Amino acid sequence: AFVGLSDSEEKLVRDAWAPIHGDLQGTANTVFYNYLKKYPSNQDKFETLKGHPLDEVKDTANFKLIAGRIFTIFDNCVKNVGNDKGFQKVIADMSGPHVARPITHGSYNDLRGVIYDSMHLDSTHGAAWNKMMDNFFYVFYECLDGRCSQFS
Ligand code: HEM
């Protein structure tokens, strides 16, 4: 279920994300690369990237756009960490294009893990981050399951 964050936890999430927020595209590029390198089955899910060596696509506009769009959503989630309806709407809107896609929960969770690992958070900040991410996935998976209207 969705579990709201405290004022102090919101601050922790904002602070945790600050290094990434100040280098959003650069972080996106690195994290998305590491994701596709560690879990190569996922590259084929992206039609613009399918059929090319990862090292060949990593420097392309197609690749950087995809990475940027993932991180822009997370950036907007962080922006809305204190507004549950707003946070839910960000996810609801991005969920639509994923509904019909053959992407496992494993793949989504693998991406979450790459992001977590890159952030090297202490346990206080990590706890708050995981509260937000648990909310993210609750909303996302509800929407993938056709129960997105509950957040409207
Ligand atoms: C959970 C974090 C994720 C976020 C925030 C996110 C966000 C987005 C955004 C903003 C778009 C652009 C909308 C569009 O033009 O379709 C998109 C498209 C897409 N995403 Fe995701 N995504 C996530 C996870 C994933 C994962 C893990 C995969 C595959 C392993 C994936 C596969 C795709 C595909 C296939 C498209 C549309 C086709 C294209 O890439 O051009 N998404 N996503």
Please render the helix and strand layout as text.
Elements lengths: L6 H15 L2 H15 L15 H4 L3 H19 L4 H12 L9 H15 L3 H22 L8
Helix pairs in contact: 1-7, 2-4, 2-6, 4-5, 5-7
The protein binds protoporphyrin IX containing FE.
The site of protoporphyrin IX containing FE has 17 residues, from helix 4 and helix 6.
Please describe what this structure looks like.
Heme b 6 binds at residue 98. The chain is mostly helical and 152 residues long. The chain has one domain (6-152): Orthogonal Bundle (Globin-like). Helices cover 67% and strands 0% of the residues. The protein has helices spanning 7-21, 24-38, 54-57, 61-79, 84-95, 105-119, 123-144. Helix 4 (61-79) packs antiparallel against helix 5 (84-95). It is globular. It starts with 6 loop residues before the first helix and ends in an 8-residue tail after the last helix. The chain binds protoporphyrin IX containing FE. Protoporphyrin IX containing FE is lined by residues 42, 45-46, 48, 66, 69-70, 73-74, 94, 97-98, 101, 103, 107-108, 111.
